[PDB]
Design a protein around this ligand. Sequence first.
Ligand SMILES: Nc1ncnc2c1ncn2[C@@H]1O[C@H](CSCC[C@H](N)C(=O)O)[C@@H](O)[C@H]1O
Length: 246
Amino acid sequence: KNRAFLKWAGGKYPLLDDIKRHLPKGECLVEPFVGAGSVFLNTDFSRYILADINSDLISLYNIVKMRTDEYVQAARELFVPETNCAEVYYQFREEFNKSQDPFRRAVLFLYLNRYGYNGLCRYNLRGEFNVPFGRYKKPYFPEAELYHFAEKAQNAFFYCESYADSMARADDSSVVYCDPPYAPLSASFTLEQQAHLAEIAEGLVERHIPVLISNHDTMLTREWYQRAKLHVVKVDELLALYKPGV
DNA sequence: CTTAAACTTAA
DNA sequence: TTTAAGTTTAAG
Ligand SMILES: Nc1ncnc2c1ncn2[C@@H]1O[C@H](CSCC[C@H](N)C(=O)O)[C@@H](O)[C@H]1O
């Protein structure tokens, strides 16, 4: 399996084989919650539409795509032993938050992802990244993963927008895979948004556009995805397949 | 995960 | 004429 170059939630390498098992074939894959892009990186659609509400993420992806060698050379300079200390980390974090240059921000974003606590991406309400130092022994520089991402990205378009807007880009030749923020385990991304996502999926499948949604397997998700074909993986993971008729 | 700060609420 | 209690946010 191909690895994402970012530490990120939703890395589903165990679930990847299961996702692909239920992901229909098509010309184009639409991912409204692309995240680290594990599915994009491990499928073979002719083209991709990849979206996320995180603007730093989407900016980074197009920079890696379009300015690959330049980016790798710049980012690699930050993965040295001298940068692995709290004082340096918090200054790079400040530089990131004060920068208005997309390229420099994208370079620092990778450093912060690998040197910060548990690959978290957390902002305050003013849009400032505020994840603390991770105190790792030796962070890994994902050079190979970066180049593989860039190569695959030649057939992808990236959009910073919410799920409703990106799902509207789907057409008859599209397949849609949704990996929303997880629903609550026991009985931000709101419950209303969770239900709304399902409503959009129902609209798409009526237009003969297949939609696959992954989430926790709870009574609430089963109610949301009640019009889909439900598959349980291995709290368990739920795969909701909206499969068009004939 | 935790504590602290910011901010609102109620009587 | 006030402030303990709640709720949300910040950040190590
Ligand atoms: N309203 C929205 N529209 C599109 N993307 C969104 C969104 N809200 C959050 N996201 C993105 O969705 C991605 C989820 S990755 C999360 C995967 C997994 N279900 C988990 O919860 O851990 C994140 O990258 C986040 O930036």
